[PDB]
Each structure stands twice: as C-alpha cells, then as structure tokens.
Amino acid sequence: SMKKVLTSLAVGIPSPLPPPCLDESVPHAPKRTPNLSPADRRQAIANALRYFNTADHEVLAEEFSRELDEYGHIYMYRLRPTQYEMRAYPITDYPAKSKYAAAMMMMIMNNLDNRVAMFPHELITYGGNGGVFNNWAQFCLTMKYLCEMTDHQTLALYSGHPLGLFPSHPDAPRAVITNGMMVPNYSTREQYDRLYAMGCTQYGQMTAGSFCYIGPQGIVHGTTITFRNAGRKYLGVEDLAGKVVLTSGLGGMSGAQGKAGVICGAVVVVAEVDPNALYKRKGQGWLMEVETDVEALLRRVRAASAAKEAVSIGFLGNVVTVWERLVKEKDEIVHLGSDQTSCHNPFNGGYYPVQLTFEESKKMMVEDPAMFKELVQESLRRQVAAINEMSARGLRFWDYGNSFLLEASRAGARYPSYVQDIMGDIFALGFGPFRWVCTSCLPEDLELTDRIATETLEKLMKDASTKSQKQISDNLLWIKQAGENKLVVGSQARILYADCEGRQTIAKNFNDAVRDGRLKGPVVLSRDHHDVSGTDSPFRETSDLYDGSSLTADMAVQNVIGDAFRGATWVSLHNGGGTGWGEATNGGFCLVLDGSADAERRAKLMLLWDVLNGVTRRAWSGNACGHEAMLRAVSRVEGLHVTVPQHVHPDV
C-alpha cells in the first residue's frame, strides 16, 4: 504494498540503522575480484562509510570489510528494504511530490524486481554486471531525493551516487545519469573492477543504470524484426511461412530465437548442447518441440515446412552436427541460417565443439585448454565448410554479431553480419526502439496502448514510403502477437520499432489517452540504447559506418545533451553498453507522458532529435539507405536543415 508501507522510501538512510544481515531465495552475483591493494581497500571502506553517521563507522567498517572479503564488493546488504516486495507499484502509491519523480521511482524498483533483475540483491539487472546502483545506500538516498524533489529541481547521479538535488526548471530533466564515464585512457576492465569496488563507478549496461529495463521481450522483438528483414533481403519473401531457419543457442538472448521464428510464422530450428538451457526454454514455452537425433529432426522439419506451421524445434546436440548432416542431404530443407553461440568467448564456455559432449567440453576447457581451443577452431572450420556447401545450394547465412565468422576466420574460413547488413539500414531510416511503461501497473492500460500503437501504425503505413511500410509491417505483425506471447514481466511494458513520425504520433496518441482518461495512469516513454542515435559502438551499433568515425563518440554525447534540453524526464550516458566497458558510449532517455500539452510538446521535440541526429550522422558517414528519408524529413520539418553528404563512389 500500500501507500503506507512505501513511506519508507522517503526516509533515506534510516536512523538508527536497520539490523545487519544472506537471502538465498534469489540468484546472487559471483564474487568480484578487484584485487585491491591495502591502500585502495582502505579507501574503498572509507568511501562506503561516507554515507553513514560517524557513530556507526566502527561497526560498519568491520561489516563492510567483511562484505569485501566475502562478496568482493560493499553492497551494504543491511540497507536493502525488506518490509515490502521490491517491484514496480502503481504511481499513485509513491509518497512523492512530483509525479515525474514517482514515475522514475517505479522504473527503478522494476529494475530491482526479483522477477526482472538478474542479481536483484546485488542491484544487478542484467548482463552479469549491468548494475542499477553501486550499493544500497545510493538506492536509499536516491529514493529519498525523488520523494523530496520538486519539478524545479534536478537529481544528479554519479554512477549510482546521488550527488544531490540542484535547482532547474519544469522543462528540465528530473534526473541526469552518468554510469562509468571515464577519462578515456583509464577505461580498462582493471580500472572498472578497482573503481567499482572503491565505490567510484559502476557499469550500467544500457537500460540497467538508466532505469528502464523491462525484461527479455526486447530481444524477442529484436530477433523477430531481424528474421523478417533477413527473409526479405536474403530470400526475397515478405512472409516466412513455410521457410525454415536453422540457428543455435538457447541462452540469454539466443533463447528468444524460438518465439521470434514462430511469431514470424516460420519453422525455426535452434540447436543447443546444454540440456539446462534447452529444457528451460522448453518448460518456459519459448521452445515448442525438442529432437534428439538429427535424422528425426530433419523428418520433423520437412513435415513442418510443407505444412507451413509456425513452430520452434529445439535440437539437443551440436549445431555443427545439423549443418554437416544437411550437406549429406540431397534435398533442400533449410532456407535461412544463422548462429548465436557465444563465440565472443570461444575457448572458455561460449562455444562447444562437435567433437566433444557438453560435459566433456566443460571439463577439457579448464583441464586441457590448448586441446580445447584446437577442437573449437577445428569445429568452427567444420561448421563454416558445411555452411559454405549449403550456401552454394541456395541457403542464406548471416552472422548474428556473436563473432562467429571472426573466430572462424582466425582459424581458417563471405557472409553478412546482422549489425552491418540489415540493422544499419534500419537505423538509417530512423526505425529503432520505442519502449513504454504504463505507470498504472494495470494490464488494461497495456492492452489499450497495444491497440493504440496498432491503430497508429496501420494508418501510418498507408502513406509511408515503400521502405518504411516494410519496417512498419514487421512491427505490426509483432504488436498483434506480442500480448498473447505473455512476455510481460514486472512492469506493464511493451516494445516495438518506429521511425521519427512513428514515435511522435504514437506518443501523442498515448498522451491523448492519458488526458482522455482512457489510460488510468501516465505513460513513460523510453528505449534500449541499441538505437540509431544513442550509441557509438565500432563493433555493433555503428559497425556499418565506414568513414572511420565509428571509433568516435561525438554522436552519443551530442544525442544525450540534445535530449536533455528538449524535454526528456531523465537522460543517461553510459560506458560500454552492449559490447563492453571501454568499447562503447551509449545513451538513452525516459519521457513521461501525463496528458499535458507540455508532455506532447516535449515528446514531439525530443523524439525528433533522438532519431534525426543519428539518421543525419549515419547518412553523413556513408549509409545511403536512409538518405532520401533524411531529405524528406528536412523538407517536412521546419527548422531542420542538415549538411547533405556528396559521397564519391570508391571506384571513381
């Protein structure tokens, strides 16, 4: 929970302190190994003690020293609230002055929900170390500030640390977030571990530190769109019904490949060596069927293809086994191929060789590392050679940004990559993540927004360009099936892709519905940082740009600054979202739609910039796919006037 129990959120650091504590009902983060020197370890304790009354220092010093020895990190477990279930509550349940701050508090608690976060009690949402706060004192103080702040104040968050409330104005963001911002030369993984333990920084991933993670439905949608575009670009079909997709991995992100294929109406085959990962997804419903022998698999796949059934079929075994079996098959069975093994970690648990069993590999990778790498590289060569033979017979393969072709290249090996071949063109058009959360926590509101988003995209597609109408159709297919796929976890949220006008129109319609009373609560707009403008990442988000600027971070910095004075309720700039610490600069936003004309104006203005910034950059950096879309925007939007690149053809 009620509004009574949530009054504690305004307390901050309780006086006197709560009793000391480990709750093993949830998964816990692995022990951190910062390897702090005696000097840094003393500083780490001192830094942590900054949050507490001096009268508590002596006992907390031993307590925090204990946490470092046992967990490798000072989480301050005794400050984690236990009098209520950590989750998103109705926005009207929060004892806050500002509805905007209340919305943020709701978003934060969702990131710390046991059902949502990876390591909830360690304040880790996803990605192993994609954190929300460095410790539970920062949580308590931030929540206190958010309950206390007005709309003429702005909360400054230094990698989890609430620096304090500073004067601003209603149109200003209520919070500015920076996670892991480093002086460029000191952004090593070693300095992360060190400074994370010393309480001077944290890794916020993308939506972990920016308070807008909503579960794995983003990956399901993402893979769905990827499959659809792959079908059009590589096969030439606007419909994947009857088409077979062979892929691998049922892990964190790759586990979504099953539902994605089904939603596309395709027969999707996912190979997984790990029975744990495979039967998990099977039990979850993300995997419809399971096959053990490859011969029975192909018979099943043949019958599925001919009957045009939307089905996900897991194969308990190595993906190389399936690939090499198809080579011995004189008949065409699989039309599309990919791979989502973790070849970014090829020799230590990410890739399992065909020569060994799952258990034998798990043993050899640490027992005989040299032998394991040799078998992996050999297995990689056998996989590519099989794909080559099948590609020559009509099959179309693409790399799913998992460094499969890169590692295969580094052993001996022509195929496109999802980031550089299909997503880059989608970003260039302006289509990217459009995420929203109904702050009423009512499923009815989510149902309505689903229908509103559907109705909006339908009318937009009728007058959209031929390129856009294909992207819009992809997201229409998704939003109509999204609800029945039961992907909602924690907060009532949804995700799709939309270009500039798509996001603007849906937002305005959402905002009208909040004002009309159809929506019983305001709606927070947000997105992943896997977007057109938000992230500079030479290995991913900007890997398709070949002017050389993929190593620069001008765009990401420009974008977050541009969002901040255009009406975002809060913004964030992170280090190494996606590809990893030091390898990316990623930023995002959240904007609360409360039905006011202000919110509509903010949304229209901000979303315009958040899309056309990257669209213009990507065009300037060599992407020609959205060049016409850019020029239409320029003609359509008053006040928009950009430098139009005249790209010389490399041959000429």
Ligand X SMILES: NC(=O)c1ccc[n+]([C@@H]2O[C@H](COP(=O)([O-])OP(=O)(O)OC[C@H]3O[C@@H](n4cnc5c(N)ncnc54)[C@H](O)[C@@H]3O)[C@@H](O)[C@H]2O)c1
Residue whose structure tokens are 């890794």? 203
Token digits of residue 13 = 């650091």
Chain positions 614 to 643 lying near a second copy, rule: CB under 8 A, are 616-617, 620, 637-643
By CB under 8 A, is residue 210 in contact with a second copy? no
Give the x/- contact pattern for a second copy in 122-161, rule: CB under 8 A: -------------------x---x--x-x-xxx-x-xx-x
Only segment of 91-99, 142-150, 246-254, 506-514 that touches ligand X (CB under 6 A)? 246-254
Chain positions 255 to 294 lying near ligand X, rule: CB under 6 A, are 271-274, 277
Closer by beta carbon to ligand X, 210 or else 318: 318
By CB under 8 A, is residue 167 in contact with a second copy? yes
Smallest gap from residue 561 Cβ to a second copy (A): 5
Closer by beta carbon to a second copy, 159 or else 456: 159
447, HSE (Cβ side, Cα atoms, 13 Å): 6
Give the x/- contact pattern for ligand X in 320-349, rule: CB under 6 A: x-------------------xxxxx-----
The answer to whether 129 is annotated as binding is no
Smallest gap from residue 190 Cβ to a second copy (A): 11
Residue of 18, 95, 242, 252 interacting with ligand X (CB under 6 A): 252
Which of a second copy, ligand X, none lies near 274, with the C-beta cut-off 5 to 8 A by kind?
A: ligand X
Interatomic CA distance for residues 399 and 490, integer angstroms: 32
Closer by beta carbon to ligand X, 536 or else 594: 536
Which of ligand X, a second copy, none lies near 277, with the C-beta cut-off 5 to 8 A by kind?
A: ligand X
* Cα 464 versus chain centre, distance: 28
273, 349, 411, 636 from 358: Cα distances, Å? 6, 10, 22, 57
Choose among 312, 328, 330: nearest CA to 247.
312
618 contacts 428 by C-beta, under 8 angstroms = yes
Interatomic CA distance for residues 597 and 629, integer angstroms: 28
Choose among 253, 286, 284, 246: nearest CA to 268.
246
The answer to whether 341 is annotated as binding is yes
Contacts of 560 (CB under 8 A, 6+ apart): 534, 571, 572, 573, 587, 588, 589
The answer to whether 344 is annotated as binding is yes
Single-letter amino acid, residue 539: F
Contacts of 440 (CB under 8 A, 6+ apart): 90, 91, 492, 519, 520, 521
Which of a second copy, ligand X, none lies near 164, with the C-beta cut-off 5 to 8 A by kind?
A: a second copy
Smallest gap from residue 252 Cβ to ligand X (A): 3
Contacts of 44 (CB under 8 A, 6+ apart): 36, 68, 74, 197, 198, 199
Bridge partner list, 397: 337
Which of ligand X, a second copy, none lies near 83, with the C-beta cut-off 5 to 8 A by kind?
A: none
Indicate the DSSP class of residue 430: T
Chain positions 14 to 43 lying near a second copy, rule: CB under 8 A, are 40, 42-43
Number of residues that bind ligand X (CB under 6 A): 29
Give the x/- contact pattern for a second copy in 225-244, rule: CB under 8 A: --------------------
Residue of 111, 125, 191, 504 interacting with a second copy (CB under 8 A): 191
Q: Is the previous residue joined to 16 through a cis bond, with omega within 30 degrees of 0?
A: yes
By CB under 8 A, is residue 652 in contact with a second copy? yes
By CB under 6 A, is residue 401 in contact with ligand X? yes
The answer to whether 272 is annotated as binding is yes
314 contacts 290 by C-beta, under 8 angstroms = yes
By CB under 8 A, is residue 254 in contact with a second copy? no
344, 379, 381, 406, 552 from 412: Cα distances, Å? 17, 11, 6, 10, 31
Closer by beta carbon to ligand X, 109 or else 395: 395
* Cα 169 versus chain centre, distance: 31
Residue of 5, 181, 237, 303 interacting with a second copy (CB under 8 A): 181
By CB under 6 A, is residue 375 in contact with ligand X? no
Interatomic CA distance for residues 536 and 577, integer angstroms: 10
The answer to whether 252 is annotated as binding is yes
Interatomic CA distance for residues 539 and 579, integer angstroms: 7
By CB under 6 A, is residue 422 in contact with ligand X? no
Q: Return the number of other C-beta atoms located less than 10 Å from residue 414's C-beta.
A: 9
By CB under 8 A, is residue 536 in contact with a second copy? yes
114 contacts 67 by C-beta, under 8 angstroms = no
351, 353, 364, 451 from 375: Cα distances, Å? 10, 6, 10, 51
Interatomic CA distance for residues 547 and 620, integer angstroms: 9
Which of a second copy, ligand X, none lies near 504, with the C-beta cut-off 5 to 8 A by kind?
A: none
Smallest gap from residue 134 Cβ to ligand X (A): 24
Residue of 327, 374, 538, 625 interacting with a second copy (CB under 8 A): 538
The answer to whether 125 is annotated as binding is no
Closer by beta carbon to a second copy, 160 or else 314: 160
By CB under 6 A, is residue 583 in contact with ligand X? no
By CB under 6 A, is residue 398 in contact with ligand X? no
Which of ligand X, a second copy, none lies near 466, with the C-beta cut-off 5 to 8 A by kind?
A: none
Helix orientation angle between 627-636 and 597-620, rounded to the nearest 10 degrees: 140
Chain positions 344 to 363 lying near a second copy, rule: CB under 8 A, are none
Smallest gap from residue 163 Cβ to ligand X (A): 27
DSSP code per residue over 473-513: HHHHHHHHHTTTTT---SS-EEEEEE-HHHHHHHHHHHHHH
Query: Binding site: what residues are annotated?
Result: 252-254, 272, 318-319, 340-342, 344, 352
Residues lying near ligand X in the complex (CB under 6 A) are found at 219, 222-223, 248-254, 271-274, 277, 318-320, 340-344, 350-352, 400-402
